[PDB]
PDB file of all heavy atoms in Angstrom:
ATOM      1  N   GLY V   1     -32.278-134.393-153.858  1.00 43.77           N
ATOM      2  CA  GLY V   1     -33.445-135.052-154.437  1.00 43.77           C
ATOM      3  C   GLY V   1     -33.115-135.912-155.637  1.00 43.77           C
ATOM      4  O   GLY V   1     -31.949-136.105-155.975  1.00 43.77           O
ATOM      5  N   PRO V   2     -34.154-136.428-156.295  1.00 42.94           N
ATOM      6  CA  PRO V   2     -34.030-137.371-157.402  1.00 42.94           C
ATOM      7  C   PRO V   2     -33.305-136.753-158.589  1.00 42.94           C
ATOM      8  O   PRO V   2     -33.857-135.896-159.277  1.00 42.94           O
ATOM      9  CB  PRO V   2     -35.481-137.699-157.775  1.00 42.94           C
ATOM     10  CG  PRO V   2     -36.352-136.996-156.784  1.00 42.94           C
ATOM     11  CD  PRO V   2     -35.529-135.954-156.101  1.00 42.94           C
ATOM     12  N   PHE V   3     -32.078-137.199-158.826  1.00 42.08           N
ATOM     13  CA  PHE V   3     -31.226-136.583-159.833  1.00 42.08           C
ATOM     14  C   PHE V   3     -31.581-137.032-161.234  1.00 42.08           C
ATOM     15  O   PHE V   3     -31.608-138.222-161.535  1.00 42.08           O
ATOM     16  CB  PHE V   3     -29.775-136.908-159.526  1.00 42.08           C
ATOM     17  CG  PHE V   3     -29.425-136.728-158.086  1.00 42.08           C
ATOM     18  CD1 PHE V   3     -28.787-137.726-157.383  1.00 42.08           C
ATOM     19  CD2 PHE V   3     -29.753-135.554-157.432  1.00 42.08           C
ATOM     20  CE1 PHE V   3     -28.466-137.551-156.052  1.00 42.08           C
ATOM     21  CE2 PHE V   3     -29.443-135.373-156.102  1.00 42.08           C
ATOM     22  CZ  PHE V   3     -28.798-136.374-155.411  1.00 42.08           C
ATOM     23  N   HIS V   4     -31.851-136.069-162.098  1.00 41.92           N
ATOM     24  CA  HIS V   4     -32.248-136.380-163.450  1.00 41.92           C
ATOM     25  C   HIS V   4     -31.065-136.275-164.394  1.00 41.92           C
ATOM     26  O   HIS V   4     -30.348-137.251-164.602  1.00 41.92           O
ATOM     27  CB  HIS V   4     -33.345-135.428-163.884  1.00 41.92           C
ATOM     28  CG  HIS V   4     -34.377-135.187-162.827  1.00 41.92           C
ATOM     29  ND1 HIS V   4     -34.452-134.010-162.115  1.00 41.92           N
ATOM     30  CD2 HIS V   4     -35.374-135.976-162.357  1.00 41.92           C
ATOM     31  CE1 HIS V   4     -35.455-134.078-161.259  1.00 41.92           C
ATOM     32  NE2 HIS V   4     -36.033-135.259-161.386  1.00 41.92           N
ATOM     33  N   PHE V   5     -30.649-137.836-164.606  1.00 39.91           N
ATOM     34  CA  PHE V   5     -29.513-137.690-165.515  1.00 39.91           C
ATOM     35  C   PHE V   5     -29.964-137.543-166.958  1.00 39.91           C
ATOM     36  O   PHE V   5     -31.132-137.731-167.280  1.00 39.91           O
ATOM     37  CB  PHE V   5     -28.579-138.895-165.400  1.00 39.91           C
ATOM     38  CG  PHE V   5     -27.837-138.958-164.106  1.00 39.91           C
ATOM     39  CD1 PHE V   5     -28.459-139.406-162.961  1.00 39.91           C
ATOM     40  CD2 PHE V   5     -26.522-138.557-164.035  1.00 39.91           C
ATOM     41  CE1 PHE V   5     -27.779-139.457-161.763  1.00 39.91           C
ATOM     42  CE2 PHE V   5     -25.834-138.607-162.841  1.00 39.91           C
ATOM     43  CZ  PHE V   5     -26.463-139.055-161.703  1.00 39.91           C
ATOM     44  N   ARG V   6     -29.025-137.227-167.834  1.00 39.12           N
ATOM     45  CA  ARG V   6     -29.361-137.026-169.223  1.00 39.12           C
ATOM     46  C   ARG V   6     -28.560-137.966-170.109  1.00 39.12           C
ATOM     47  O   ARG V   6     -28.650-137.907-171.336  1.00 39.12           O
ATOM     48  CB  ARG V   6     -29.091-135.576-169.612  1.00 39.12           C
ATOM     49  CG  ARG V   6     -29.715-134.554-168.671  1.00 39.12           C
ATOM     50  CD  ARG V   6     -31.235-134.598-168.711  1.00 39.12           C
ATOM     51  NE  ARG V   6     -31.828-133.296-168.421  1.00 39.12           N
ATOM     52  CZ  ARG V   6     -31.849-132.744-167.215  1.00 39.12           C
ATOM     53  NH1 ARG V   6     -31.302-133.383-166.188  1.00 39.12           N
ATOM     54  NH2 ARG V   6     -32.408-131.555-167.036  1.00 39.12           N
ATOM     55  N   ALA V   7     -27.823-138.091-170.385  1.00 35.98           N
ATOM     56  CA  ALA V   7     -26.728-138.920-170.878  1.00 35.98           C
ATOM     57  C   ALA V   7     -27.214-140.334-171.150  1.00 35.98           C
ATOM     58  O   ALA V   7     -27.270-141.169-170.250  1.00 35.98           O
ATOM     59  CB  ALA V   7     -25.589-138.938-169.871  1.00 35.98           C
ATOM     60  N   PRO V   8     -27.549-140.616-172.408  1.00 34.14           N
ATOM     61  CA  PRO V   8     -28.156-141.902-172.676  1.00 34.14           C
ATOM     62  C   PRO V   8     -27.716-142.863-171.605  1.00 34.14           C
ATOM     63  O   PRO V   8     -28.450-143.120-170.653  1.00 34.14           O
ATOM     64  CB  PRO V   8     -27.570-142.304-174.034  1.00 34.14           C
ATOM     65  CG  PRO V   8     -26.598-141.225-174.411  1.00 34.14           C
ATOM     66  CD  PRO V   8     -26.966-140.018-173.611  1.00 34.14           C
ATOM     67  N   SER V   9     -26.507-143.379-171.751  1.00 32.55           N
ATOM     68  CA  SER V   9     -25.900-144.135-170.684  1.00 32.55           C
ATOM     69  C   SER V   9     -26.779-144.035-169.442  1.00 32.55           C
ATOM     70  O   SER V   9     -27.818-144.689-169.350  1.00 32.55           O
ATOM     71  CB  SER V   9     -24.516-143.570-170.393  1.00 32.55           C
ATOM     72  OG  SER V   9     -24.509-142.166-170.595  1.00 32.55           O
ATOM     73  N   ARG V  10     -26.360-143.207-168.488  1.00 31.82           N
ATOM     74  CA  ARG V  10     -27.105-143.031-167.245  1.00 31.82           C
ATOM     75  C   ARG V  10     -28.507-143.612-167.352  1.00 31.82           C
ATOM     76  O   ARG V  10     -28.889-144.484-166.571  1.00 31.82           O
ATOM     77  CB  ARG V  10     -27.197-141.548-166.879  1.00 31.82           C
ATOM     78  CG  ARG V  10     -26.226-141.084-165.800  1.00 31.82           C
ATOM     79  CD  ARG V  10     -24.812-141.601-166.017  1.00 31.82           C
ATOM     80  NE  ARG V  10     -24.683-142.983-165.571  1.00 31.82           N
ATOM     81  CZ  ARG V  10     -24.878-143.377-164.317  1.00 31.82           C
ATOM     82  NH1 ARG V  10     -25.216-142.490-163.386  1.00 31.82           N
ATOM     83  NH2 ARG V  10     -24.742-144.657-163.993  1.00 31.82           N
ATOM     84  N   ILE V  11     -29.267-143.123-168.326  1.00 30.94           N
ATOM     85  CA  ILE V  11     -30.657-143.520-168.483  1.00 30.94           C
ATOM     86  C   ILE V  11     -30.810-145.031-168.518  1.00 30.94           C
ATOM     87  O   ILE V  11     -31.360-145.632-167.594  1.00 30.94           O
ATOM     88  CB  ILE V  11     -31.261-142.964-169.777  1.00 30.94           C
ATOM     89  CG1 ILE V  11     -31.220-141.443-169.776  1.00 30.94           C
ATOM     90  CG2 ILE V  11     -32.702-143.420-169.928  1.00 30.94           C
ATOM     91  CD1 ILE V  11     -32.046-140.839-170.890  1.00 30.94           C
ATOM     92  N   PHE V  12     -30.343-145.640-169.599  1.00 34.76           N
ATOM     93  CA  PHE V  12     -30.440-147.078-169.735  1.00 34.76           C
ATOM     94  C   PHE V  12     -30.459-147.714-168.351  1.00 34.76           C
ATOM     95  O   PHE V  12     -31.194-147.269-167.468  1.00 34.76           O
ATOM     96  CB  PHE V  12     -29.269-147.632-170.545  1.00 34.76           C
ATOM     97  CG  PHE V  12     -29.121-149.116-170.437  1.00 34.76           C
ATOM     98  CD1 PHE V  12     -29.996-149.960-171.095  1.00 34.76           C
ATOM     99  CD2 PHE V  12     -28.123-149.662-169.661  1.00 34.76           C
ATOM    100  CE1 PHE V  12     -29.875-151.329-170.985  1.00 34.76           C
ATOM    101  CE2 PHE V  12     -27.994-151.029-169.548  1.00 34.76           C
ATOM    102  CZ  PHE V  12     -28.871-151.864-170.212  1.00 34.76           C
ATOM    103  N   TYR V  13     -28.795-147.109-167.945  1.00 35.57           N
ATOM    104  CA  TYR V  13     -28.586-147.426-166.537  1.00 35.57           C
ATOM    105  C   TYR V  13     -29.897-147.444-165.765  1.00 35.57           C
ATOM    106  O   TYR V  13     -30.645-148.425-165.797  1.00 35.57           O
ATOM    107  CB  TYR V  13     -27.663-146.401-165.899  1.00 35.57           C
ATOM    108  CG  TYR V  13     -26.946-146.918-164.684  1.00 35.57           C
ATOM    109  CD1 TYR V  13     -26.090-147.999-164.776  1.00 35.57           C
ATOM    110  CD2 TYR V  13     -27.109-146.318-163.448  1.00 35.57           C
ATOM    111  CE1 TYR V  13     -25.413-148.477-163.667  1.00 35.57           C
ATOM    112  CE2 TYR V  13     -26.437-146.788-162.331  1.00 35.57           C
ATOM    113  CZ  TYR V  13     -25.587-147.868-162.448  1.00 35.57           C
ATOM    114  OH  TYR V  13     -24.912-148.350-161.347  1.00 35.57           O
ATOM    115  N   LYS V  14     -30.171-146.346-165.068  1.00 39.77           N
ATOM    116  CA  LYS V  14     -31.379-146.231-164.262  1.00 39.77           C
ATOM    117  C   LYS V  14     -32.304-147.406-164.499  1.00 39.77           C
ATOM    118  O   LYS V  14     -32.260-148.402-163.777  1.00 39.77           O
ATOM    119  CB  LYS V  14     -32.113-144.929-164.587  1.00 39.77           C
ATOM    120  CG  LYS V  14     -32.873-144.334-163.405  1.00 39.77           C
ATOM    121  CD  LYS V  14     -34.378-144.335-163.612  1.00 39.77           C
ATOM    122  CE  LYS V  14     -34.789-143.332-164.677  1.00 39.77           C
ATOM    123  NZ  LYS V  14     -36.172-142.823-164.465  1.00 39.77           N
ATOM    124  N   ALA V  15     -33.142-147.287-165.519  1.00 37.97           N
ATOM    125  CA  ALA V  15     -34.145-148.302-165.785  1.00 37.97           C
ATOM    126  C   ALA V  15     -33.593-149.709-165.616  1.00 37.97           C
ATOM    127  O   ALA V  15     -34.350-150.676-165.593  1.00 37.97           O
ATOM    128  CB  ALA V  15     -34.711-148.131-167.180  1.00 37.97           C
ATOM    129  N   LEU V  16     -32.279-149.831-165.502  1.00 38.66           N
ATOM    130  CA  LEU V  16     -31.684-151.138-165.301  1.00 38.66           C
ATOM    131  C   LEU V  16     -31.828-151.565-163.846  1.00 38.66           C
ATOM    132  O   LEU V  16     -30.846-151.969-163.206  1.00 38.66           O
ATOM    133  CB  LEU V  16     -30.212-151.130-165.704  1.00 38.66           C
ATOM    134  CG  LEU V  16     -29.444-152.381-165.271  1.00 38.66           C
ATOM    135  CD1 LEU V  16     -28.119-152.497-166.011  1.00 38.66           C
ATOM    136  CD2 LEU V  16     -29.232-152.377-163.764  1.00 38.66           C
ATOM    137  N   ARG V  17     -31.375-150.341-163.850  1.00 42.31           N
ATOM    138  CA  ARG V  17     -31.156-150.491-162.414  1.00 42.31           C
ATOM    139  C   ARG V  17     -32.466-150.783-161.703  1.00 42.31           C
ATOM    140  O   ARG V  17     -32.726-151.911-161.282  1.00 42.31           O
ATOM    141  CB  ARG V  17     -30.512-149.225-161.839  1.00 42.31           C
ATOM    142  CG  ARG V  17     -30.558-149.103-160.319  1.00 42.31           C
ATOM    143  CD  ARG V  17     -31.461-147.959-159.883  1.00 42.31           C
ATOM    144  NE  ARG V  17     -30.956-147.274-158.693  1.00 42.31           N
ATOM    145  CZ  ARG V  17     -31.098-145.970-158.456  1.00 42.31           C
ATOM    146  NH1 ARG V  17     -31.721-145.190-159.334  1.00 42.31           N
ATOM    147  NH2 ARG V  17     -30.607-145.439-157.344  1.00 42.31           N
ATOM    148  N   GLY V  18     -33.293-149.757-161.576  1.00 36.61           N
ATOM    149  CA  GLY V  18     -34.563-149.913-160.903  1.00 36.61           C
ATOM    150  C   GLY V  18     -34.831-151.372-160.602  1.00 36.61           C
ATOM    151  O   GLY V  18     -35.379-151.699-159.553  1.00 36.61           O
ATOM    152  N   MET V  19     -34.431-152.256-161.510  1.00 37.99           N
ATOM    153  CA  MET V  19     -34.776-153.664-161.377  1.00 37.99           C
ATOM    154  C   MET V  19     -33.771-154.460-160.544  1.00 37.99           C
ATOM    155  O   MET V  19     -33.927-155.668-160.363  1.00 37.99           O
ATOM    156  CB  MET V  19     -34.908-154.306-162.749  1.00 37.99           C
ATOM    157  CG  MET V  19     -35.348-153.353-163.835  1.00 37.99           C
ATOM    158  SD  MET V  19     -35.736-154.248-165.352  1.00 37.99           S
ATOM    159  CE  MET V  19     -35.912-152.899-166.520  1.00 37.99           C
ATOM    160  N   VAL V  20     -32.740-153.790-160.040  1.00 35.86           N
ATOM    161  CA  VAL V  20     -31.760-154.452-159.184  1.00 35.86           C
ATOM    162  C   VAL V  20     -31.832-153.860-157.784  1.00 35.86           C
ATOM    163  O   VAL V  20     -31.442-152.715-157.564  1.00 35.86           O
ATOM    164  CB  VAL V  20     -30.323-154.299-159.724  1.00 35.86           C
ATOM    165  CG1 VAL V  20     -29.326-154.902-158.752  1.00 35.86           C
ATOM    166  CG2 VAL V  20     -30.185-154.948-161.089  1.00 35.86           C
ATOM    167  N   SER V  21     -32.337-154.641-156.837  1.00 37.94           N
ATOM    168  CA  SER V  21     -32.459-154.176-155.461  1.00 37.94           C
ATOM    169  C   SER V  21     -31.124-153.645-154.952  1.00 37.94           C
ATOM    170  O   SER V  21     -30.219-154.416-154.648  1.00 37.94           O
ATOM    171  CB  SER V  21     -32.945-155.315-154.562  1.00 37.94           C
ATOM    172  OG  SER V  21     -32.890-154.950-153.192  1.00 37.94           O
ATOM    173  N   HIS V  22     -31.002-152.329-154.852  1.00 41.18           N
ATOM    174  CA  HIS V  22     -29.752-151.730-154.410  1.00 41.18           C
ATOM    175  C   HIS V  22     -29.867-151.215-152.986  1.00 41.18           C
ATOM    176  O   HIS V  22     -29.390-150.121-152.680  1.00 41.18           O
ATOM    177  CB  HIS V  22     -29.388-150.570-155.318  1.00 41.18           C
ATOM    178  CG  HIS V  22     -30.441-149.515-155.372  1.00 41.18           C
ATOM    179  ND1 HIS V  22     -31.640-149.699-156.024  1.00 41.18           N
ATOM    180  CD2 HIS V  22     -30.486-148.271-154.841  1.00 41.18           C
ATOM    181  CE1 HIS V  22     -32.376-148.609-155.901  1.00 41.18           C
ATOM    182  NE2 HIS V  22     -31.699-147.727-155.189  1.00 41.18           N
ATOM    183  N   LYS V  23     -31.308-151.785-152.419  1.00 41.07           N
ATOM    184  CA  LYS V  23     -30.436-150.915-151.636  1.00 41.07           C
ATOM    185  C   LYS V  23     -29.493-151.739-150.773  1.00 41.07           C
ATOM    186  O   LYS V  23     -28.803-151.205-149.908  1.00 41.07           O
ATOM    187  CB  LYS V  23     -31.265-149.983-150.751  1.00 41.07           C
ATOM    188  CG  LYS V  23     -31.832-148.763-151.464  1.00 41.07           C
ATOM    189  CD  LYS V  23     -33.342-148.702-151.283  1.00 41.07           C
ATOM    190  CE  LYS V  23     -33.907-147.310-151.493  1.00 41.07           C
ATOM    191  NZ  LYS V  23     -33.959-146.557-150.207  1.00 41.07           N
ATOM    192  N   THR V  24     -29.455-153.040-151.023  1.00 39.58           N
ATOM    193  CA  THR V  24     -28.607-153.932-150.251  1.00 39.58           C
ATOM    194  C   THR V  24     -27.217-154.075-150.848  1.00 39.58           C
ATOM    195  O   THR V  24     -26.804-153.299-151.713  1.00 39.58           O
ATOM    196  CB  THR V  24     -29.202-155.340-150.192  1.00 39.58           C
ATOM    197  OG1 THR V  24     -28.748-156.096-151.324  1.00 39.58           O
ATOM    198  CG2 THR V  24     -30.719-155.268-150.189  1.00 39.58           C
ATOM    199  N   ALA V  25     -26.507-155.093-150.376  1.00 38.57           N
ATOM    200  CA  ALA V  25     -25.143-155.338-150.796  1.00 38.57           C
ATOM    201  C   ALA V  25     -25.136-156.128-152.084  1.00 38.57           C
ATOM    202  O   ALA V  25     -24.573-155.692-153.086  1.00 38.57           O
ATOM    203  CB  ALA V  25     -24.397-156.095-149.717  1.00 38.57           C
ATOM    204  N   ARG V  26     -25.759-157.298-152.051  1.00 40.37           N
ATOM    205  CA  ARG V  26     -25.891-158.086-153.254  1.00 40.37           C
ATOM    206  C   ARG V  26     -26.240-157.155-154.398  1.00 40.37           C
ATOM    207  O   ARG V  26     -25.920-157.424-155.555  1.00 40.37           O
ATOM    208  CB  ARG V  26     -26.971-159.150-153.099  1.00 40.37           C
ATOM    209  CG  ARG V  26     -27.503-159.651-154.430  1.00 40.37           C
ATOM    210  CD  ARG V  26     -27.624-161.162-154.460  1.00 40.37           C
ATOM    211  NE  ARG V  26     -28.532-161.587-155.511  1.00 40.37           N
ATOM    212  CZ  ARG V  26     -29.851-161.492-155.414  1.00 40.37           C
ATOM    213  NH1 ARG V  26     -30.396-160.995-154.312  1.00 40.37           N
ATOM    214  NH2 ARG V  26     -30.625-161.892-156.413  1.00 40.37           N
ATOM    215  N   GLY V  27     -26.895-156.048-154.069  1.00 40.05           N
ATOM    216  CA  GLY V  27     -27.220-155.039-155.065  1.00 40.05           C
ATOM    217  C   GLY V  27     -26.026-154.715-155.944  1.00 40.05           C
ATOM    218  O   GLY V  27     -25.123-155.537-156.116  1.00 40.05           O
ATOM    219  N   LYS V  28     -25.559-153.941-154.670  1.00 40.12           N
ATOM    220  CA  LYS V  28     -24.462-153.165-155.231  1.00 40.12           C
ATOM    221  C   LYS V  28     -23.484-154.074-155.956  1.00 40.12           C
ATOM    222  O   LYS V  28     -23.232-153.916-157.150  1.00 40.12           O
ATOM    223  CB  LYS V  28     -23.740-152.409-154.122  1.00 40.12           C
ATOM    224  CG  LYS V  28     -24.648-151.481-153.334  1.00 40.12           C
ATOM    225  CD  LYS V  28     -23.910-150.830-152.175  1.00 40.12           C
ATOM    226  CE  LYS V  28     -24.789-149.817-151.459  1.00 40.12           C
ATOM    227  NZ  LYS V  28     -26.131-150.375-151.137  1.00 40.12           N
ATOM    228  N   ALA V  29     -22.932-155.028-155.218  1.00 38.80           N
ATOM    229  CA  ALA V  29     -22.062-156.029-155.805  1.00 38.80           C
ATOM    230  C   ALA V  29     -22.577-156.392-157.187  1.00 38.80           C
ATOM    231  O   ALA V  29     -21.936-157.125-157.935  1.00 38.80           O
ATOM    232  CB  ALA V  29     -22.010-157.258-154.915  1.00 38.80           C
ATOM    233  N   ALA V  30     -23.746-155.866-157.518  1.00 38.32           N
ATOM    234  CA  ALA V  30     -24.339-156.093-158.818  1.00 38.32           C
ATOM    235  C   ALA V  30     -23.999-154.932-159.738  1.00 38.32           C
ATOM    236  O   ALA V  30     -23.319-155.102-160.752  1.00 38.32           O
ATOM    237  CB  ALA V  30     -25.842-156.234-158.682  1.00 38.32           C
ATOM    238  N   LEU V  31     -24.486-153.748-159.381  1.00 33.23           N
ATOM    239  CA  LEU V  31     -24.134-152.541-160.125  1.00 33.23           C
ATOM    240  C   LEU V  31     -22.722-152.274-160.606  1.00 33.23           C
ATOM    241  O   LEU V  31     -22.505-151.558-161.583  1.00 33.23           O
ATOM    242  CB  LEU V  31     -25.092-151.352-159.996  1.00 33.23           C
ATOM    243  CG  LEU V  31     -26.541-151.776-159.756  1.00 33.23           C
ATOM    244  CD1 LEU V  31     -27.470-150.595-159.980  1.00 33.23           C
ATOM    245  CD2 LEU V  31     -26.934-152.948-160.643  1.00 33.23           C
ATOM    246  N   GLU V  32     -21.765-152.853-159.895  1.00 34.67           N
ATOM    247  CA  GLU V  32     -20.377-152.753-160.275  1.00 34.67           C
ATOM    248  C   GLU V  32     -20.210-153.523-161.560  1.00 34.67           C
ATOM    249  O   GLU V  32     -19.793-152.986-162.583  1.00 34.67           O
ATOM    250  CB  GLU V  32     -19.500-153.375-159.198  1.00 34.67           C
ATOM    251  CG  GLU V  32     -20.102-153.282-157.809  1.00 34.67           C
ATOM    252  CD  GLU V  32     -19.133-153.714-156.729  1.00 34.67           C
ATOM    253  OE1 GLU V  32     -17.947-153.943-157.052  1.00 34.67           O
ATOM    254  OE2 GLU V  32     -19.559-153.822-155.559  1.00 34.67           O
ATOM    255  N   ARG V  33     -20.557-154.797-161.498  1.00 31.97           N
ATOM    256  CA  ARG V  33     -20.394-155.672-162.633  1.00 31.97           C
ATOM    257  C   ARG V  33     -20.742-154.963-163.946  1.00 31.97           C
ATOM    258  O   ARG V  33     -20.194-155.293-164.997  1.00 31.97           O
ATOM    259  CB  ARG V  33     -21.255-156.923-162.442  1.00 31.97           C
ATOM    260  CG  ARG V  33     -20.919-157.718-161.184  1.00 31.97           C
ATOM    261  CD  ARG V  33     -21.788-158.964-161.072  1.00 31.97           C
ATOM    262  NE  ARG V  33     -21.452-159.802-159.920  1.00 31.97           N
ATOM    263  CZ  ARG V  33     -22.256-160.015-158.881  1.00 31.97           C
ATOM    264  NH1 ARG V  33     -23.457-159.452-158.835  1.00 31.97           N
ATOM    265  NH2 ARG V  33     -21.857-160.797-157.885  1.00 31.97           N
ATOM    266  N   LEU V  34     -21.631-153.976-163.884  1.00 31.44           N
ATOM    267  CA  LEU V  34     -22.140-153.336-165.098  1.00 31.44           C
ATOM    268  C   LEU V  34     -21.535-151.971-165.379  1.00 31.44           C
ATOM    269  O   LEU V  34     -21.585-151.075-164.547  1.00 31.44           O
ATOM    270  CB  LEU V  34     -23.656-153.174-165.007  1.00 31.44           C
ATOM    271  CG  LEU V  34     -24.245-152.114-165.941  1.00 31.44           C
ATOM    272  CD1 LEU V  34     -24.485-152.699-167.319  1.00 31.44           C
ATOM    273  CD2 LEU V  34     -25.542-151.556-165.382  1.00 31.44           C
ATOM    274  N   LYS V  35     -20.990-151.807-166.574  1.00 35.59           N
ATOM    275  CA  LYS V  35     -20.556-150.498-167.018  1.00 35.59           C
ATOM    276  C   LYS V  35     -21.549-149.981-168.042  1.00 35.59           C
ATOM    277  O   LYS V  35     -22.681-150.457-168.099  1.00 35.59           O
ATOM    278  CB  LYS V  35     -19.164-150.584-167.625  1.00 35.59           C
ATOM    279  CG  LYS V  35     -18.229-151.444-166.801  1.00 35.59           C
ATOM    280  CD  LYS V  35     -16.775-151.140-167.098  1.00 35.59           C
ATOM    281  CE  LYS V  35     -15.883-152.064-166.288  1.00 35.59           C
ATOM    282  NZ  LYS V  35     -16.385-152.216-164.891  1.00 35.59           N
ATOM    283  N   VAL V  36     -21.135-149.009-168.847  1.00 36.75           N
ATOM    284  CA  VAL V  36     -22.005-148.489-169.892  1.00 36.75           C
ATOM    285  C   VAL V  36     -21.490-147.208-170.514  1.00 36.75           C
ATOM    286  O   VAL V  36     -21.143-146.262-169.816  1.00 36.75           O
ATOM    287  CB  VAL V  36     -23.406-148.195-169.345  1.00 36.75           C
ATOM    288  CG1 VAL V  36     -24.287-147.625-170.446  1.00 36.75           C
ATOM    289  CG2 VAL V  36     -24.010-149.460-168.757  1.00 36.75           C
ATOM    290  N   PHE V  37     -21.460-147.181-171.836  1.00 32.87           N
ATOM    291  CA  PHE V  37     -21.060-145.988-172.545  1.00 32.87           C
ATOM    292  C   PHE V  37     -21.874-145.830-173.820  1.00 32.87           C
ATOM    293  O   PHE V  37     -22.364-146.807-174.387  1.00 32.87           O
ATOM    294  CB  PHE V  37     -19.584-146.061-172.917  1.00 32.87           C
ATOM    295  CG  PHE V  37     -18.746-146.830-171.944  1.00 32.87           C
ATOM    296  CD1 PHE V  37     -18.594-148.193-172.075  1.00 32.87           C
ATOM    297  CD2 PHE V  37     -18.087-146.184-170.919  1.00 32.87           C
ATOM    298  CE1 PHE V  37     -17.809-148.906-171.190  1.00 32.87           C
ATOM    299  CE2 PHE V  37     -17.301-146.888-170.028  1.00 32.87           C
ATOM    300  CZ  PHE V  37     -17.163-148.253-170.162  1.00 32.87           C
ATOM    301  N   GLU V  38     -22.009-144.589-174.270  1.00 35.77           N
ATOM    302  CA  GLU V  38     -22.576-144.308-175.575  1.00 35.77           C
ATOM    303  C   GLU V  38     -21.423-144.199-176.562  1.00 35.77           C
ATOM    304  O   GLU V  38     -20.579-143.306-176.456  1.00 35.77           O
ATOM    305  CB  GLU V  38     -23.359-143.006-175.535  1.00 35.77           C
ATOM    306  CG  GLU V  38     -22.513-141.818-175.108  1.00 35.77           C
ATOM    307  CD  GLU V  38     -21.469-142.187-174.066  1.00 35.77           C
ATOM    308  OE1 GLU V  38     -20.826-143.250-174.217  1.00 35.77           O
ATOM    309  OE2 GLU V  38     -21.284-141.407-173.105  1.00 35.77           O
ATOM    310  N   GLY V  39     -21.384-145.125-177.512  1.00 39.26           N
ATOM    311  CA  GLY V  39     -20.253-145.241-178.423  1.00 39.26           C
ATOM    312  C   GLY V  39     -19.220-146.205-177.870  1.00 39.26           C
ATOM    313  O   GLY V  39     -18.977-146.247-176.664  1.00 39.26           O
ATOM    314  N   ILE V  40     -18.601-146.979-178.751  1.00 39.85           N
ATOM    315  CA  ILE V  40     -17.636-147.969-178.320  1.00 39.85           C
ATOM    316  C   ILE V  40     -16.255-147.358-178.219  1.00 39.85           C
ATOM    317  O   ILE V  40     -15.567-147.229-179.228  1.00 39.85           O
ATOM    318  CB  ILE V  40     -17.575-149.134-179.309  1.00 39.85           C
ATOM    319  CG1 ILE V  40     -18.991-149.600-179.647  1.00 39.85           C
ATOM    320  CG2 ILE V  40     -16.755-150.274-178.726  1.00 39.85           C
ATOM    321  CD1 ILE V  40     -19.040-150.778-180.598  1.00 39.85           C
ATOM    322  N   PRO V  41     -15.839-147.000-176.992  1.00 39.08           N
ATOM    323  CA  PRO V  41     -14.588-146.303-176.696  1.00 39.08           C
ATOM    324  C   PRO V  41     -13.373-147.070-177.159  1.00 39.08           C
ATOM    325  O   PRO V  41     -13.110-147.146-178.358  1.00 39.08           O
ATOM    326  CB  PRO V  41     -14.585-146.222-175.171  1.00 39.08           C
ATOM    327  CG  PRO V  41     -15.393-147.390-174.746  1.00 39.08           C
ATOM    328  CD  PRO V  41     -16.500-147.453-175.762  1.00 39.08           C
ATOM    329  N   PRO V  42     -12.609-147.612-176.207  1.00 36.72           N
ATOM    330  CA  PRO V  42     -11.478-148.425-176.559  1.00 36.72           C
ATOM    331  C   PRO V  42     -11.622-149.841-176.012  1.00 36.72           C
ATOM    332  O   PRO V  42     -12.218-150.705-176.658  1.00 36.72           O
ATOM    333  CB  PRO V  42     -10.328-147.699-175.859  1.00 36.72           C
ATOM    334  CG  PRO V  42     -10.972-147.045-174.663  1.00 36.72           C
ATOM    335  CD  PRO V  42     -12.473-147.128-174.830  1.00 36.72           C
TER     336      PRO V  42
END
């Protein structure tokens, strides 16, 4: 079922997402382009 992430990241994600039609290819080819972290790693 609908997985409830917690992790700021994930979240942002989601709501991002929602706005990018995934369930197709152009989607996905979209979701890759985007990363995301809480805190600036390296």
Side-chain angles (χ1 to χ4, degrees):
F3 314 129
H4 318 106
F5 290 78
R6 309 294 210 287
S9 34
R10 259 45 280 299
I11 300 192
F12 166 74
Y13 204 61
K14 211 246 290 208
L16 169 164
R17 165 247 216 146
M19 331 189 190
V20 175
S21 172
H22 58 288
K23 280 125 158 269
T24 88
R26 159 135 161 284
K28 302 176 175 49
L31 330 194
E32 331 189 8
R33 301 181 177 114
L34 160 84
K35 316 201 182 318
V36 179
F37 329 88
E38 58 325 43
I40 313 181

